[PDB]
Protein backbone atom coordinates (compact mmCIF):
# COMPACT_ATOMS: atom_id res chain seq x y z
CA UNK A 1 0.00 0.00 0.00
CA UNK A 2 2.59 2.68 0.93
CA UNK A 3 4.78 4.14 -1.79
CA UNK A 4 7.08 7.13 -2.10
CA UNK A 5 8.45 9.46 0.56
CA UNK A 6 7.46 12.65 2.37
CA UNK A 7 9.64 15.56 3.54
CA UNK A 8 8.87 18.87 5.25
CA UNK A 9 11.19 21.67 6.34
CA UNK A 10 9.30 24.94 7.18
CA UNK A 11 10.04 26.93 4.02
CA UNK A 12 10.72 30.33 5.66
CA UNK A 13 13.86 31.26 7.59
CA UNK A 14 15.52 34.58 8.42
CA UNK A 15 18.87 35.15 10.11
CA UNK A 16 20.53 38.44 11.11
CA UNK A 17 24.25 38.50 11.91
CA UNK A 18 27.14 40.91 12.47
CA UNK A 19 30.49 40.70 10.66
CA UNK A 20 32.95 38.25 12.19
CA UNK A 21 30.30 35.99 13.73
CA UNK A 22 30.44 32.20 13.97
CA UNK A 23 26.74 31.49 13.56
CA UNK A 24 25.43 28.12 12.36
CA UNK A 25 22.49 27.98 9.94
CA UNK A 26 20.76 24.72 10.91
CA UNK A 27 17.60 23.37 9.29
CA UNK A 28 15.20 20.77 10.75
CA UNK A 29 14.29 18.13 8.16
CA UNK A 30 11.30 15.91 8.93
CA UNK A 31 10.84 12.81 6.83
CA UNK A 32 9.02 9.53 6.34
CA UNK A 33 10.42 7.07 3.82
CA UNK A 34 9.44 3.69 2.35
CA UNK A 35 11.09 1.47 -0.31
CA UNK A 36 14.41 1.24 1.59
CA UNK A 37 16.67 1.50 -1.52
CA UNK A 38 16.63 5.26 -2.14
CA UNK A 39 18.95 8.15 -3.06
CA UNK A 40 19.22 11.36 -1.02
CA UNK A 41 20.75 14.62 -2.29
CA UNK A 42 20.82 17.42 0.29
CA UNK A 43 21.92 20.51 -1.63
CA UNK A 44 22.74 24.03 -0.43
CA UNK A 45 22.49 26.78 -3.06
CA UNK A 46 23.26 30.49 -2.89
CA UNK A 47 22.12 33.64 -4.66
CA UNK A 48 23.34 37.19 -3.97
CA UNK A 49 20.47 39.54 -3.18
CA UNK A 50 20.23 43.05 -4.55
CA UNK A 51 18.91 45.71 -2.14
CA UNK A 52 17.21 47.38 -5.11
CA UNK A 53 14.67 44.51 -5.11
CA UNK A 54 12.66 44.94 -1.92
CA UNK A 55 10.28 42.07 -2.86
CA UNK A 56 12.46 39.02 -3.54
CA UNK A 57 9.98 37.03 -5.63
CA UNK A 58 10.82 33.34 -5.17
CA UNK A 59 8.75 31.41 -7.73
CA UNK A 60 8.74 28.34 -5.53
CA UNK A 61 6.61 26.05 -7.70
CA UNK A 62 9.38 25.95 -10.31
CA UNK A 63 11.80 23.47 -8.68
CA UNK A 64 9.21 20.67 -8.75
CA UNK A 65 8.48 21.10 -12.46
CA UNK A 66 11.70 19.94 -14.16
CA UNK A 67 11.57 21.42 -17.68
CA UNK A 68 9.31 24.45 -17.61
CA UNK A 69 10.66 26.61 -20.47
CA UNK A 70 8.85 29.57 -18.93
CA UNK A 71 10.99 29.36 -15.78
CA UNK A 72 14.55 29.70 -17.04
CA UNK A 73 13.94 32.68 -19.30
CA UNK A 74 13.74 35.58 -16.82
CA UNK A 75 16.71 37.08 -18.74
CA UNK A 76 18.83 36.42 -15.61
CA UNK A 77 18.59 35.19 -12.03
CA UNK A 78 19.10 38.75 -10.84
CA UNK A 79 16.88 39.10 -7.76
CA UNK A 80 14.15 36.50 -8.47
CA UNK A 81 14.73 32.85 -7.58
CA UNK A 82 14.19 30.91 -10.79
CA UNK A 83 15.00 27.19 -11.33
CA UNK A 84 17.75 25.91 -8.99
CA UNK A 85 20.02 25.57 -12.04
CA UNK A 86 20.32 29.36 -12.18
CA UNK A 87 21.65 29.47 -8.61
CA UNK A 88 25.21 28.63 -7.59
CA UNK A 89 26.04 25.37 -5.82
CA UNK A 90 27.46 25.83 -2.32
CA UNK A 91 27.18 22.46 -0.55
CA UNK A 92 26.28 19.00 -1.85
CA UNK A 93 25.79 15.91 0.31
CA UNK A 94 24.85 12.65 -1.39
CA UNK A 95 23.53 9.45 0.18
CA UNK A 96 23.80 7.18 -2.86
CA UNK A 97 22.07 3.79 -2.96
CA UNK A 98 21.24 3.98 0.74
CA UNK A 99 19.57 0.82 2.04
CA UNK A 100 18.97 1.20 5.80
CA UNK A 101 16.18 3.80 5.64
CA UNK A 102 13.86 2.95 8.55
CA UNK A 103 16.01 4.75 11.18
CA UNK A 104 18.47 7.59 11.92
CA UNK A 105 20.59 8.77 8.99
CA UNK A 106 23.70 8.03 11.07
CA UNK A 107 23.35 4.42 9.88
CA UNK A 108 23.83 5.24 6.18
CA UNK A 109 26.92 7.46 6.30
CA UNK A 110 27.41 9.27 3.00
CA UNK A 111 29.73 11.87 1.55
CA UNK A 112 29.58 15.67 1.45
CA UNK A 113 31.61 17.37 -1.27
CA UNK A 114 31.65 21.16 -1.19
CA UNK A 115 32.93 23.60 -3.76
CA UNK A 116 35.83 25.54 -2.18
CA UNK A 117 34.71 28.84 -3.75
CA UNK A 118 33.07 29.38 -0.34
CA UNK A 119 34.31 28.62 3.16
CA UNK A 120 31.27 27.37 5.07
CA UNK A 121 32.39 24.43 7.18
CA UNK A 122 29.76 21.70 6.76
CA UNK A 123 28.36 19.78 9.73
CA UNK A 124 26.27 16.71 10.65
CA UNK A 125 24.22 15.04 7.93
CA UNK A 126 24.91 17.89 5.53
CA UNK A 127 21.74 19.60 6.75
CA UNK A 128 23.43 22.66 8.29
CA UNK A 129 26.09 25.24 7.43
CA UNK A 130 28.55 26.49 10.02
CA UNK A 131 29.79 29.97 9.12
CA UNK A 132 33.19 30.76 10.64
CA UNK A 133 34.66 34.29 10.92
CA UNK A 134 32.33 35.51 8.23
CA UNK A 135 33.13 38.49 6.00
CA UNK A 136 30.39 40.80 4.78
CA UNK A 137 30.56 39.38 1.23
CA UNK A 138 28.75 36.15 2.18
CA UNK A 139 25.41 37.89 2.79
CA UNK A 140 22.70 36.62 0.47
CA UNK A 141 19.87 34.14 0.12
CA UNK A 142 20.75 30.53 0.90
CA UNK A 143 18.30 27.82 -0.15
CA UNK A 144 18.15 24.19 0.99
CA UNK A 145 16.72 21.63 -1.42
CA UNK A 146 16.38 17.87 -0.92
CA UNK A 147 16.32 15.53 -3.91
CA UNK A 148 14.75 12.16 -3.15
CA UNK A 149 15.64 9.63 -5.88
CA UNK A 150 15.94 12.54 -8.34
CA UNK A 151 12.87 14.66 -7.52
CA UNK A 152 12.51 17.69 -5.27
CA UNK A 153 10.72 16.72 -2.06
CA UNK A 154 11.20 19.76 0.19
CA UNK A 155 12.72 23.22 -0.11
CA UNK A 156 13.26 25.86 2.58
CA UNK A 157 14.55 29.35 1.83
CA UNK A 158 16.59 31.23 4.41
CA UNK A 159 17.67 34.87 4.24
CA UNK A 160 21.11 35.57 5.70
CA UNK A 161 22.19 39.20 5.87
CA UNK A 162 23.38 41.88 8.25
CA UNK A 163 21.25 44.64 9.76
CA UNK A 164 22.37 47.35 7.31
CA UNK A 165 21.29 45.90 3.92
CA UNK A 166 18.57 43.43 4.98
CA UNK A 167 15.92 42.49 2.37
CA UNK A 168 12.66 40.56 2.85
CA UNK A 169 11.55 37.74 0.52
CA UNK A 170 8.00 36.97 -0.69
CA UNK A 171 7.29 33.44 -1.94
CA UNK A 172 5.01 33.11 -4.98
CA UNK A 173 3.40 30.24 -6.89
CA UNK A 174 3.10 30.02 -10.67
CA UNK A 175 4.87 31.77 -13.54
Amino acid sequence: QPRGAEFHMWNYHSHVFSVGDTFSLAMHLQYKIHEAPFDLLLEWLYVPIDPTCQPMRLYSTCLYHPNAPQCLSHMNSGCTFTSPHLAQRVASTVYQNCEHADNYTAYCLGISHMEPSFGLILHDGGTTLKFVDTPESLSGLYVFVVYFNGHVEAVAYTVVSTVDHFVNAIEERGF
Partner: antibody
Amino acid sequence: QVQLQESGPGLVKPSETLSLTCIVSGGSISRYYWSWIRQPPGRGLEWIGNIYYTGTTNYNPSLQSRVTISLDTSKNQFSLRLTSVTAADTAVYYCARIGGVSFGERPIDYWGQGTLVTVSS
Amino acid sequence: DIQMTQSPSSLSASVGDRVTITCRASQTISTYLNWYQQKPGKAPKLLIYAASTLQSGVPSRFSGSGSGTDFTLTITSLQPEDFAAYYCQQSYSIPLTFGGGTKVEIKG
Protein backbone atom coordinates in the same frame (compact mmCIF):
# COMPACT_ATOMS: atom_id res chain seq x y z
CA GLN B 1 7.01 19.74 32.41
CA VAL B 2 8.59 23.08 31.46
CA GLN B 3 7.16 26.40 32.61
CA LEU B 4 7.23 29.83 30.97
CA GLN B 5 6.67 33.24 32.55
CA GLU B 6 6.11 36.63 30.92
CA SER B 7 7.51 39.78 32.56
CA GLY B 8 6.35 42.64 30.36
CA PRO B 9 4.66 45.94 31.19
CA GLY B 10 0.88 46.04 31.34
CA LEU B 11 0.44 49.57 29.94
CA VAL B 12 2.31 51.11 26.99
CA LYS B 13 1.67 54.56 25.53
CA PRO B 14 0.96 54.74 21.77
CA SER B 15 3.79 54.96 19.23
CA GLU B 16 6.30 53.39 21.63
CA THR B 17 8.48 50.25 21.75
CA LEU B 18 6.81 47.39 23.60
CA SER B 19 9.28 44.98 25.21
CA LEU B 20 8.53 41.57 26.74
CA THR B 21 10.81 38.93 28.25
CA CYS B 22 9.87 35.26 28.56
CA ILE B 23 11.75 33.22 31.18
CA VAL B 24 11.81 29.42 30.90
CA SER B 25 12.25 26.70 33.51
CA GLY B 26 12.24 22.88 33.60
CA GLY B 27 13.99 22.04 30.34
CA SER B 28 17.00 24.00 29.31
CA ILE B 29 16.45 25.82 26.00
CA SER B 30 18.13 23.81 23.46
CA ARG B 31 16.52 21.63 20.76
CA TYR B 32 13.15 23.41 20.58
CA TYR B 33 11.69 26.43 18.82
CA TRP B 34 10.48 29.30 20.98
CA SER B 35 7.54 31.37 19.78
CA TRP B 36 5.30 34.31 20.64
CA ILE B 37 1.56 34.36 19.93
CA ARG B 38 -0.87 37.30 20.04
CA GLN B 39 -4.58 37.22 20.84
CA PRO B 40 -6.96 40.22 20.72
CA PRO B 41 -9.40 40.42 23.64
CA GLY B 42 -12.26 38.90 21.64
CA ARG B 43 -10.84 37.76 18.31
CA GLY B 44 -8.96 34.57 17.57
CA LEU B 45 -5.27 34.32 18.37
CA GLU B 46 -2.61 34.92 15.72
CA TRP B 47 1.03 33.98 15.33
CA ILE B 48 3.67 36.72 15.52
CA GLY B 49 6.99 34.86 15.17
CA ASN B 50 9.42 32.29 16.58
CA ILE B 51 13.15 31.72 16.95
CA TYR B 52 15.54 28.78 16.92
CA TYR B 53 18.44 28.49 19.37
CA THR B 54 20.90 29.79 16.70
CA GLY B 55 19.30 32.89 15.23
CA THR B 56 17.04 31.58 12.46
CA THR B 57 14.09 33.85 13.21
CA ASN B 58 10.83 33.15 11.38
CA TYR B 59 8.51 36.15 11.19
CA ASN B 60 4.85 36.57 10.34
CA PRO B 61 4.95 38.70 7.15
CA SER B 62 1.82 40.69 8.07
CA LEU B 63 3.87 42.35 10.84
CA GLN B 64 7.59 41.81 10.16
CA SER B 65 9.18 45.28 9.89
CA ARG B 66 8.10 46.06 13.47
CA VAL B 67 8.93 42.85 15.39
CA THR B 68 12.29 41.55 16.61
CA ILE B 69 12.95 38.40 18.65
CA SER B 70 16.18 37.96 20.63
CA LEU B 71 17.63 35.06 22.62
CA ASP B 72 19.34 35.03 26.02
CA THR B 73 20.32 31.37 26.42
CA SER B 74 22.89 32.44 29.03
CA LYS B 75 19.98 33.68 31.18
CA ASN B 76 17.59 31.00 29.80
CA GLN B 77 15.23 33.65 28.42
CA PHE B 78 14.06 35.10 25.13
CA SER B 79 12.84 38.63 24.47
CA LEU B 80 10.33 40.20 22.08
CA ARG B 81 10.44 43.82 20.92
CA LEU B 82 7.69 45.52 18.91
CA THR B 83 8.31 49.07 17.72
CA SER B 84 5.59 51.60 16.85
CA VAL B 85 2.79 49.89 18.77
CA THR B 86 -0.64 50.96 17.52
CA ALA B 87 -4.10 50.64 19.07
CA ALA B 88 -4.60 47.22 17.45
CA ASP B 89 -1.69 45.65 19.36
CA THR B 90 -3.64 45.65 22.65
CA ALA B 91 -3.88 41.91 23.27
CA VAL B 92 -2.79 38.94 25.35
CA TYR B 93 0.76 37.88 24.51
CA TYR B 94 1.81 34.27 25.13
CA CYS B 95 5.30 32.80 24.93
CA ALA B 96 5.35 29.10 24.09
CA ARG B 97 7.52 26.35 22.64
CA ILE B 98 7.29 24.37 19.39
CA GLY B 99 8.75 20.86 19.22
CA GLY B 100 7.95 17.30 18.22
CA VAL B 101 10.02 14.82 16.18
CA SER B 102 7.87 12.91 13.67
CA PHE B 103 6.63 13.54 10.15
CA GLY B 104 3.65 15.72 11.11
CA GLU B 105 4.43 16.47 14.76
CA ARG B 106 5.05 20.21 15.09
CA PRO B 107 2.62 21.39 17.77
CA ILE B 108 2.56 24.37 20.11
CA ASP B 109 2.70 21.97 23.04
CA TYR B 110 3.72 23.90 26.16
CA TRP B 111 2.18 27.36 26.41
CA GLY B 112 3.05 30.19 28.76
CA GLN B 113 0.80 31.97 31.22
CA GLY B 114 0.43 35.01 28.95
CA THR B 115 0.23 38.70 29.85
CA LEU B 116 -2.15 41.48 28.81
CA VAL B 117 -0.61 44.47 27.02
CA THR B 118 -2.81 47.53 26.47
CA VAL B 119 -2.10 50.88 24.78
CA SER B 120 -3.71 54.12 26.02
CA SER B 121 -2.79 57.65 27.10
CA ASP C 1 -0.81 32.92 4.22
CA ILE C 2 -2.87 29.72 4.28
CA GLN C 3 -6.42 30.53 5.32
CA MET C 4 -7.92 28.22 7.95
CA THR C 5 -11.71 28.01 8.16
CA GLN C 6 -13.18 26.48 11.32
CA SER C 7 -16.84 25.44 11.52
CA PRO C 8 -19.24 25.82 13.24
CA SER C 9 -18.75 29.11 15.14
CA SER C 10 -21.09 28.35 18.08
CA LEU C 11 -22.81 25.11 19.08
CA SER C 12 -24.79 23.87 22.07
CA ALA C 13 -25.26 20.18 22.88
CA SER C 14 -26.35 18.35 26.02
CA VAL C 15 -24.11 16.20 28.21
CA GLY C 16 -22.75 13.10 26.50
CA ASP C 17 -23.47 14.16 22.91
CA ARG C 18 -20.98 13.56 20.11
CA VAL C 19 -19.52 16.93 19.08
CA THR C 20 -17.93 17.27 15.64
CA ILE C 21 -16.02 20.33 14.41
CA THR C 22 -14.52 20.72 10.93
CA CYS C 23 -11.38 22.56 9.80
CA ARG C 24 -10.50 23.40 6.19
CA ALA C 25 -7.33 24.78 4.60
CA SER C 26 -6.55 26.58 1.36
CA GLN C 27 -3.77 24.13 0.41
CA THR C 28 -2.89 20.52 1.12
CA ILE C 29 -1.31 20.27 4.58
CA SER C 30 -0.70 16.57 5.15
CA THR C 31 -1.17 15.61 8.84
CA TYR C 32 0.38 18.96 9.81
CA LEU C 33 -2.21 20.65 12.01
CA ASN C 34 -3.05 20.58 15.71
CA TRP C 35 -6.18 21.11 17.81
CA TYR C 36 -6.03 23.25 20.97
CA GLN C 37 -8.52 23.79 23.80
CA GLN C 38 -8.67 27.24 25.42
CA LYS C 39 -10.71 27.52 28.61
CA PRO C 40 -11.92 31.06 29.44
CA GLY C 41 -9.21 33.00 31.28
CA LYS C 42 -6.68 30.19 30.97
CA ALA C 43 -4.08 29.71 28.23
CA PRO C 44 -4.79 27.30 25.35
CA LYS C 45 -3.75 23.68 25.90
CA LEU C 46 -2.58 21.20 23.27
CA LEU C 47 -5.22 18.55 22.56
CA ILE C 48 -4.23 16.85 19.29
CA TYR C 49 -0.98 16.96 17.31
CA ALA C 50 -0.19 15.46 13.89
CA ALA C 51 -3.98 15.75 13.27
CA SER C 52 -4.45 12.20 14.57
CA THR C 53 -2.35 11.79 17.76
CA LEU C 54 -3.38 12.35 21.38
CA GLN C 55 -1.25 14.55 23.61
CA SER C 56 -0.11 12.85 26.82
CA GLY C 57 -2.50 13.43 29.71
CA VAL C 58 -5.62 14.07 27.61
CA PRO C 59 -8.81 12.00 28.01
CA SER C 60 -9.40 9.61 25.12
CA ARG C 61 -12.77 11.18 24.25
CA PHE C 62 -10.92 13.75 22.11
CA SER C 63 -10.14 12.30 18.68
CA GLY C 64 -8.57 13.95 15.64
CA SER C 65 -8.92 12.73 12.07
CA GLY C 66 -8.49 13.86 8.48
CA SER C 67 -5.65 14.90 6.20
CA GLY C 68 -4.90 16.88 3.07
CA THR C 69 -7.33 19.81 3.15
CA ASP C 70 -10.04 18.42 5.47
CA PHE C 71 -9.73 17.78 9.21
CA THR C 72 -12.13 16.94 12.02
CA LEU C 73 -12.05 17.09 15.82
CA THR C 74 -14.52 14.89 17.72
CA ILE C 75 -15.57 14.90 21.37
CA THR C 76 -17.11 11.47 21.94
CA SER C 77 -19.16 12.32 25.05
CA LEU C 78 -19.48 15.89 26.32
CA GLN C 79 -18.74 16.65 29.97
CA PRO C 80 -19.42 19.73 32.13
CA GLU C 81 -15.64 20.42 32.04
CA ASP C 82 -15.35 20.54 28.20
CA PHE C 83 -17.08 23.96 27.97
CA ALA C 84 -13.95 25.64 26.54
CA ALA C 85 -13.31 26.92 23.00
CA TYR C 86 -11.38 25.03 20.32
CA TYR C 87 -8.90 26.13 17.63
CA CYS C 88 -7.26 24.33 14.70
CA GLN C 89 -3.75 25.51 13.74
CA GLN C 90 -1.63 24.52 10.74
CA SER C 91 2.13 23.96 10.86
CA TYR C 92 2.94 23.10 7.22
CA SER C 93 3.81 26.62 6.01
CA ILE C 94 5.09 29.84 7.56
CA PRO C 95 3.29 31.92 8.73
CA LEU C 96 1.60 29.29 10.89
CA THR C 97 -2.04 30.34 11.21
CA PHE C 98 -5.01 29.51 13.43
CA GLY C 99 -8.71 28.97 12.83
CA GLY C 100 -11.65 31.15 13.75
CA GLY C 101 -12.58 29.14 16.81
CA THR C 102 -15.66 27.17 17.91
CA LYS C 103 -17.69 27.89 21.05
CA VAL C 104 -19.03 24.65 22.54
CA GLU C 105 -21.74 25.45 25.10
CA ILE C 106 -23.30 22.86 27.38
CA LYS C 107 -27.09 22.48 27.12
CA GLY C 108 -27.51 19.48 29.43
